[PDB]
Design an enzyme around this catalytic site. Structure first.
Site, PDB file in Angstrom:
ATOM      1  N   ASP A 142       0.914   9.119  11.905  1.00 27.66           N
ATOM      2  CA  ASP A 142      -0.046   8.213  11.284  1.00 27.66           C
ATOM      3  C   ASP A 142      -0.336   7.032  12.204  1.00 27.66           C
ATOM      4  O   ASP A 142      -0.495   5.913  11.751  1.00 27.66           O
ATOM      5  CB  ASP A 142       0.543   7.754   9.952  1.00 27.66           C
ATOM      6  CG  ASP A 142      -0.444   6.987   9.088  1.00 27.66           C
ATOM      7  OD1 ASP A 142      -1.619   7.422   8.976  1.00 27.66           O
ATOM      8  OD2 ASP A 142      -0.022   5.943   8.529  1.00 27.66           O
ATOM      9  N   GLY A 155       0.857  -1.180   0.000  1.00 28.61           N
ATOM     10  CA  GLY A 155       0.000   0.000   0.000  1.00 28.61           C
ATOM     11  C   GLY A 155       0.882   1.215   0.000  1.00 28.61           C
ATOM     12  O   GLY A 155       1.984   1.158  -0.564  1.00 28.61           O
ATOM     13  N   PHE A 192       2.590   2.332   2.288  1.00 30.67           N
ATOM     14  CA  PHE A 192       3.802   1.970   2.978  1.00 30.67           C
ATOM     15  C   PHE A 192       4.795   1.238   2.095  1.00 30.67           C
ATOM     16  O   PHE A 192       5.874   0.924   2.560  1.00 30.67           O
ATOM     17  CB  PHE A 192       3.496   1.125   4.231  1.00 30.67           C
ATOM     18  CG  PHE A 192       2.644  -0.076   3.969  1.00 30.67           C
ATOM     19  CD1 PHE A 192       3.223  -1.285   3.579  1.00 30.67           C
ATOM     20  CD2 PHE A 192       1.265  -0.020   4.145  1.00 30.67           C
ATOM     21  CE1 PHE A 192       2.442  -2.423   3.357  1.00 30.67           C
ATOM     22  CE2 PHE A 192       0.461  -1.153   3.911  1.00 30.67           C
ATOM     23  CZ  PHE A 192       1.059  -2.360   3.504  1.00 30.67           C
TER      24      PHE A 192
HETATM   25  C1  26K Z   1       0.088  -2.381   7.544  1.00 37.22           C
HETATM   26  N1  26K Z   1      -0.104  -3.825   7.455  1.00 37.22           N
HETATM   27  C2  26K Z   1      -0.451  -4.179   6.090  1.00 37.22           C
HETATM   28  C3  26K Z   1       1.096  -4.529   7.854  1.00 37.22           C
HETATM   29  C4  26K Z   1       1.607  -5.468   6.750  1.00 37.22           C
HETATM   30  N2  26K Z   1       1.998  -6.755   7.321  1.00 37.22           N
HETATM   31  C5  26K Z   1       3.114  -6.958   8.078  1.00 37.22           C
HETATM   32  C6  26K Z   1       3.298  -8.199   8.730  1.00 37.22           C
HETATM   33  C7  26K Z   1       4.409  -8.423   9.535  1.00 37.22           C
HETATM   34  N3  26K Z   1       5.312  -7.444   9.650  1.00 37.22           N
HETATM   35  N4  26K Z   1       6.487  -7.494  10.424  1.00 37.22           N
HETATM   36  C8  26K Z   1       7.080  -6.256  10.234  1.00 37.22           C
HETATM   37  C9  26K Z   1       6.250  -5.522   9.380  1.00 37.22           C
HETATM   38  C10 26K Z   1       6.526  -4.201   8.973  1.00 37.22           C
HETATM   39  C11 26K Z   1       5.718  -3.431   8.135  1.00 37.22           C
HETATM   40  N5  26K Z   1       6.343  -2.243   7.984  1.00 37.22           N
HETATM   41  N6  26K Z   1       7.522  -2.301   8.735  1.00 37.22           N
HETATM   42  C12 26K Z   1       7.664  -3.503   9.363  1.00 37.22           C
HETATM   43  C13 26K Z   1       5.138  -6.273   9.013  1.00 37.22           C
HETATM   44  N7  26K Z   1       4.054  -5.981   8.238  1.00 37.22           N
END
Ligand code: 26K
Length: 274
Positions: free
Chosen positions: A135, A15, A17
């Protein structure tokens, strides 16, 4: 160096991010998250003490990753011709608070208190390190389902903490304060308290309180689930229309609703295991 010292697994999500994958550092099997961001979609650059032009996300992460903390730490990063690659840590097993809430609905107050408190601590850590996240919301919080520890993610809309006025915002609108909506002006701590109020409602009610600008400006919160009077009082205090009427972080953690927090492990034993 060179990039295949990590082994790439499944796409975890993508996304604003960037795209994040599950990974394992081959050197010691350590779980990691590999985030890629295209240089094209980076609007906010910084520089590293060394002199290199990096994304601001990496500047902010380096400042908060001194560890230990309730922030997911940046272990390493790499530049590419058209993207940056960030190697962050990854709890196993893990679920983001958004999916956790989608699945369980409104959280029990004892659970909300543990979770909110741990968020407070992480946000204190970032501020204490000179970082504003800008955020804070359930999608940006990971739960380590074994240890019951929360962890803050996705600093791509963050800034260095400063005491003067912010006239720029790229966070999530429905977590943004009335003074941004009306005037395009806020201060870091008071906007962060406001979004912590939207988060606290989100946890106890199962959903955010406002969807529309008009609702934010008006700041009147209706409760749709049975929530305690002390919890309602704290929520409405974080959601005060005037920034200066919002509580400090210390006043939040000294509010009567925040007393007797569970420790993470008890929290996971009671509310998360099995
Ligand atoms: C916003 N949401 C879609 C989270 C996406 N799923 C994940 C799952 C496990 N992790 N473990 C570190 C991360 C991380 C995400 N950004 N920085 C570290 C992470 N993200």
């Amino acid at each position: 160096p060179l990039e295949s010292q990590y082994q790439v697994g499944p796409l975890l999500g993508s996304g604003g991010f960037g795209s994040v994958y599950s990974g394992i550092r081959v050197s010691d099997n350590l779980p990691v998250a590999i985030k890629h961001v295209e240089k094209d979609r980076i609007s906010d650059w910084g520089e590293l003490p060394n002199g290199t032009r990096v994304p601001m996300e990496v500047v902010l992460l380096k400042k908060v990753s001194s560890g230990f903390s309730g922030v997911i730490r940046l272990l390493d990063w790499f530049e590419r011709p058209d993207s940056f690659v960030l190697i962050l840590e990854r709890p196993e097993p893990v679920q983001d608070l958004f999916d956790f809430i989608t699945e369980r609905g409104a959280l029990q107050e004892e659970l909300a208190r543990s979770f909110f408190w741990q968020v407070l601590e992480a946000v204190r850590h970032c501020h204490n390190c000179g970082v504003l996240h800008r955020d804070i919301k359930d999608e940006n919080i990971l739960i380590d389902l074994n240890r019951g520890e929360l962890k803050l993610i996705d600093f791509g809309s963050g800034a260095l903490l400063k005491d003067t006025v912010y006239t720029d915002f790229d966070g999530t609108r429905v977590y943004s304060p009335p003074e941004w909506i009306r005037y395009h002006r806020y201060h870091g701590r008071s906007a962060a308290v406001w979004s912590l109020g939207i988060l606290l409602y989100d946890m106890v009610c199962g959903d955010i309180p406002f969807e529309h600008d008009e609702e934010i400006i008006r700041g009147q919160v209706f409760f749709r689930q049975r929530v305690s009077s002390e919890c309602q009082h704290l929520i409405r205090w974080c959601l005060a229309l005037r920034p200066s009427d919002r509580p400090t972080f210390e006043e939040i953690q000294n509010h009567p609703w925040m007393q007797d927090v569970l420790l993470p492990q008890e929290t996971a034993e009671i509310h998360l295991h099995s």
